[PDB]
């Protein structure tokens, strides 16, 4: 479970939590101003809990292995864009399975489209996820067009 | 105990030490190039067996709950401006009690007075000191107007 | 064993092997990226080993506590200018004996070449390598004066 931060953002990496974890998973997030949590791999727990605590759940699952969406993409930036000067010095979970993949992609873009070439984007993640993204995942971020329209 | 790093400054945020502690939190200190500590917190032990080190003791502590001084500020800020350059690759180590509020906003300071908007200032030591800064605290940086002499 | 990361690059200083560690350090490398590493202490081992493994092995071993080299130094240049751009998000993991001394500076070196100040450098190797650097290495690192022919 690492998080990042460039900027004024600070996105943190989760392990998909199960369903018993929760309760100690919320205790873990609420320590990390993590007021959202966006969910890209497949939801295996309810969010109930979560949302009756304070932490907005939007989950936009994936398949793992296509590239995230096109539509996400813009959500994910809508979102990013805003809250980071919303709640200053605040958090967003990115959560996947296994958090080396899409998760990572997700954090990636955002570190792009907010400046940044995605080659140093790359290293930066892995700097802090050792072997986070592969060949795919890669291929795309570099095919990646970025509309930069992100001013800080 | 956690150290950051910004340009050519490098800060160390500390656990208050004990009495006990001292002999091995200056081998511990002595093996960071701390050159200098300012006490934010009341002090809770002697500093001639610090001094007695090389090391140099600058303490202004203040009331825990209240906007670090008007002057400290500039003391801070004077301290800072110099050392990172008097002694390069040095450290300076801020240490409050706890450790996560006035020795971070003091740090969160020259952070941004050198340059860096708060936000970015508030996410780079959350990065690092996890559930540091409160709602207070927090509101006075906002607040905080840096002259922004720092030429580095 | 820890890495660092400026721009595209991401540099890995290691634990000089044994000949028994081989195995797991090529296990351990495999999972960095770590396409390329350039020895600078004296060579304890095969490289076959190694070299069977795709990673590539350059050692230019050179007197601990003398400068590192005049040439060697285009080498690192040389071949720190391609890699990070032949294979995006890769790596390169320079070792010496203990790495807290020509490790660093070769490492330290390219994140002056390509940008920063030297001060800036040590604070950000130290900042991940507590005590690397001596007297004499950063006096010549100070000395050290940059082509900045990196563009990025």
Chains 1, 2, 3 share one sequence.
């Not at 320590?31 to 295996?44: D, L, P, Q, S, W």
């Not at 727990?45 to 699952?61: A, F, M, N, R, S």
């Not at 864009?81 to 605040?90: A, D, H, N, Y």
Request: with cysteine; aromatic share 10%.
């Amino acid at each position: 479970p690492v998080e990042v931060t460039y900027k004024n953002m600070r996105f943190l990496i989760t392990h998909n939590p199960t369903n018993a974890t929760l309760n100690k998973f919320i205790e873990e997030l609420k320590k990390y101003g993590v007021t959202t949590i966006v969910r890209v791999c497949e939801a295996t727990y309810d969010t109930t809990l979560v949302e009756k605590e304070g932490i907005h759940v939007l989950d936009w699952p994936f398949d793992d292995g296509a590239p995230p969406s096109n539509q996400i993409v813009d959500d994910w930036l809508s979102l990013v864009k805003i809250k980071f000067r919303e709640e200053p010095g605040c958090c967003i979970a990115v959560h996947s399975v296994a958090g080396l993949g899409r998760a990572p992609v997700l954090v990636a873009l955002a570190l792009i489209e907010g400046g940044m070439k995605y080659e140093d984007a790359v290293q930066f993640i892995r700097q802090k996820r050792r072997g986070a993204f592969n060949s795919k995942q890669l291929l795309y971020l570099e095919k990646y067009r970025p509309k930069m329209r992100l001013r800080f």
